[PDB]
Design a protein around this ligand. Structure first.
Ligand SMILES: [Ca+2]
Length: 176
């Protein structure tokens, strides 16, 4: 796609991000029951890719967290910022703590503070440095709000392994 088209679409994503309420009510995607909100970012139905070389993961990102999406890649939590970076953005990307055939976020618990993951979209590849690692009740995801003046992406999965009673949140902060 041509540069001028990419920039218009990114401008749309930014406008969307700057419209978001800073205080979503995020419901646990794993225990809950077709999305157009991220159409500007979509190429063949994917909005991006998330790579965590620290653990050998590189998987596609799709809009929403339907079970169809989570079977095949990472799902973007609607109500959070779209993964294009910027101040006052906080995107949440979700994936299973492993599937039969796919590692997905199986080893997210092995990511450490200071390590760097990458989110690639139609425009560029963004780098995020891990700054926090937390475990919370599934019924507590709303806290994962957009923080004024910060550019964050949280990677979200279930824990402990093979139990999945709780949720692991690994938050990275934009490296400018
Ligand atoms: Ca929609």
């Amino acid at each position: 796609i041509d540069t001028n088209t990419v920039e218009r679409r990114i401008a749309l994503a930014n406008a969307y991000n700057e419209t978001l309420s800073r205080n979503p009510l995020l419901i646990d995607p794993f225990t809950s029951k077709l999305r157009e909100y991220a159409r500007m970012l979509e190429v063949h139905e994917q909005i991006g890719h998330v790579a965590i070389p620290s653990i050998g993961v590189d998987i596609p990102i799709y809009a929403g967290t339907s079970e169809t999406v989570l079977q095949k890649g990472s799902g973007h939590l609607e109500g959070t910022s779209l993964p294009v970076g910027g101040l006052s953005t906080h995107s949440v990307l979700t994936a299973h703590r492993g599937l039969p055939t796919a590692r997905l976020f199986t080893d997210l618990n092995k990511v450490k503070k200071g390590q760097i993951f990458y989110v690639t979209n139609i425009k560029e590849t963004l780098a995020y440095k891990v700054v926090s690692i937390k475990v919370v009740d599934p019924t507590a995801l709303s806290e994962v709000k957009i923080v004024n003046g910060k550019d964050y992406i949280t990677l979200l999965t279930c824990t402990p392994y093979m139990i999945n009673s709780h949720r692991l949140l690994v938050k990275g902060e934009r490296i400018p």
